Amino acid sequence: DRICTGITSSNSPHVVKTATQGEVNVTGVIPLTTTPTKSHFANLKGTKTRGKLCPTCLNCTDLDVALGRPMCVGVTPSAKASILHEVRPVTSGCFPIMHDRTKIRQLPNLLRGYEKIRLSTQNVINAEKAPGGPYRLGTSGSCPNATSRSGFFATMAWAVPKDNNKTATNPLTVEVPHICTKEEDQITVWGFHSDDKTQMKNLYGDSNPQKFTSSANGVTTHYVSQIGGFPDQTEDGGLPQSGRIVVDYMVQKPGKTGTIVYQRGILLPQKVWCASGRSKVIKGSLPLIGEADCLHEKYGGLNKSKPYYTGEHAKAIGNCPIWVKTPLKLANGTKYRPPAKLL
């Protein structure tokens, strides 16, 4: 008799690419990829995940928290990973702001890129004794407390001339010192108030537009104010007001003093942000539901099965599958062979 070595023949619907034989049909494969499905976002397994800056602060938005709005001041927990849910963070109270006249909206998005964020407990500047005559620290019913009908942002002081016969002033300069640790960046919030002609006269003793310039870490910004004819109030406390504020921020690296040059209507910095470390930030949608291995910008929260994935590539953090252009397969069988017959 004759005895020979041989290889099986079975259905071979699977295809894989080779270097020397091109594409070959095979009896079996191990898929290496999947295409994920869109799910809600979640917490990162093994990493505390930040949503709102101050989650204990209810009815408050991230911008509100970043500005230090009354009733909206609380704990801002550390986190090594963060979700960016507002590309244009809005406010929900206090005094009417002309947001798009500065970069202020992005302040809370800047804060979330740090691991630790805390609001300073002491004021960086004494506003009452600040340059330009003694000031009273202005307040408004637009910014109500829980134990008061009136207030203002904790991060700023509405510096208004106290004395009678208040007048126009030359531009004055304050230095803003770094009051955080050597390991911390300081984010200083400042701005200016304006109103209509008569109220401007009443409050500051000048009805002309006022000028402002900030300088920190080599960046200079210049602003000129507007007298009356303001755009409608929005994103504020709901109370009608005749004036508006413009608010901005300066980043000061550790050991770097910044300066502000101002005239009448100045909102001097008080509480500043102290921020350290880095958080991995990706675009996201709230609420966070459950845990997941990986957070993906186009698919949401997901757990890792296969080592690779196909579909839409986007930023993604955690224990994630690696993107590939094509559904790769690892051959787990033999190459196709036509069935052999006797005659």
């Binding site: 008799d1 004759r2 005895i3 020979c4 070595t5 041989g6 290889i7 099986t8 023949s9 079975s10 894989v16 690419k17 080779t18 270097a19 020397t20 034989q21 009896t27 191990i30 290496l32 960016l84 590309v87 970069k103 992005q106 998005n109 800047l110 890129g113 740090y114 880095r278 958080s279 991995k280 930030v281 990706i282 675009k283 080592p307 690779y308 590539h313 930023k315 993604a316 953090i317 955690g318 994630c320 690696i322 993107w323 590939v324 252009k325 094509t326 790769l328 397969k329 690892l330 051959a331 787990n332 069988g333 033999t334 190459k335 062979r337 036509p338 069935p339 052999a340 017959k341 006797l342």
Partner: protein, 170 residues
């Protein structure tokens, strides 16, 4: 490609069900087919190890820049977007290459499995069998399904046909 030049059978046997490679017997009983479990398990294990190796690659996350804000820093965010895309592209290519070489290895190893099965068969069949060279041996005896089954398990003895055998070292 080896079998093509060496005249190895280019077809396969549907009866071979318990495995991927093995043996056929010809002659007068007609044709018997038996899968060799050692060769099959060896192939399966190589593929499994290959799978582990491919599943072991780890790469850095791509997330947002922490300092670059929207609107204010759009040019930077554009360069950032470009960086993400080129990383995904390049690593995708490198992975396709790793998988390509893996699959090339498996398909190429098929004929090597056959060559090894020929050495195992050669030793078991004993010195009375004749080597043809195309993976086939001519025997002095009959080999029905029960014989082929004894070959597949390495329990085959040429002594049972009163034929010379190779002994095994202690």
């Amino acid at each position: 490609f080896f079998g093509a030049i060496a005249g190895f059978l280019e077809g396969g046997w549907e009866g071979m069900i318990a495995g991927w490679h093995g043996y056929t017997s010809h002659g007068a009983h007609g044709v018997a087919v038996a899968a060799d479990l050692k060769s099959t398990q060896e192939a399966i294990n190589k593929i499994t190890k290959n799978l582990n190796s491919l599943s072991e690659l780890e790469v850095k996350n791509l997330q947002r820049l922490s300092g670059a804000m929207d609107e204010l820093h759009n040019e930077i965010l554009e360069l950032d977007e470009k960086v993400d895309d080129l990383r995904a592209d390049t690593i995708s290519s490198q992975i396709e290459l790793a998988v390509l070489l893996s699959n090339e290895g498996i398909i190429n190893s098929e004929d090597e499995h056959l060559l090894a099965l020929e050495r195992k068969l050669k030793k078991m069949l004993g010195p009375s069998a004749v080597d043809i060279g195309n993976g086939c041996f001519e025997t002095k005896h009959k080999c029905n399904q029960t014989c082929l089954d004894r070959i597949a398990a390495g329990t085959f003895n040429a002594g049972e046909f009163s034929l010379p055998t190779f002994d095994s070292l202690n």
